[PDB]
């Protein structure tokens, strides 16, 4: 391959052992031709550090469903079926924030205004408050910031939708080798308080603000409750190398080492083959795992999926 050895994505010994081990899932390569610094630049959420108020779902008489897909409950909100890609940027913290916010806006604005909240804006105008930009960040501040400063609107890279659409291109990690391995290297883009030409309203007239920012309790049922009456939520869990290989079924960490922390958007649950799972939306494109979504073992706070559930309500009127 003209270059030196080492860091070749992951070894087949992995894929195959994860498979011979015969567990709740099955793995296969999602990334082809990539510098391993990329595979670790994806996992750019910190874990630890802050944590909003608290949200205690009063249990009582509400019987939640044995399964649930936040996309079905609200077909009117297309935002829910969207899978974003973050390019070579550790902005996963900002994506879960916006992808969860996007939905909630459509959810709580009656089913009125559905709007692609901009990760571009959160990513580049939040600063040291939220963390480190393209090199890691705190989902707590992510929401805190929406409530403080508010976020404009911005679709996908080169989508021409709204004020500030994400400026980072996706890496062709999907499936090719005519180009070289899109290394995770990258710099955090600049805070440009300005909408795309031709776009109206004005950037300042595009900021959508939130109501408050709270933490969801570390109990699965409370979470099932939050997603059920409010809308998808942003989480955090630890990434180990095997997870990179997810193709289908319910994930369970088997081997490999920590790639780092990765935020996501949980938007549902169900039980597949007697294994309760959480339906989570990644930010690695639609060619990753199962059409961009994936399932992780729920109820046993797997890899910390049930620890960091940050979230909040949008500002009506």
From Swiss-Prot:
> Which residues does the annotation flag as glycosylated?
176
Q: Which residues form the active site?
A: 92, 262, 282
Here the disulfide bonds are 77-106, 89-134, 125-191, 126-130, 163-195, 171-182
Q: What is the lineage of its organism?
A: Eukaryota, Metazoa, Chordata, Craniata, Vertebrata
Q: Which domain of life is it from?
A: Eukaryota
Q: Which residues of the full protein are shown?
A: 81 to 333 of 339
Which named protein is this?
Cathepsin B
Q: Which residues carry this modification: N6-acetyllysine?
A: 204
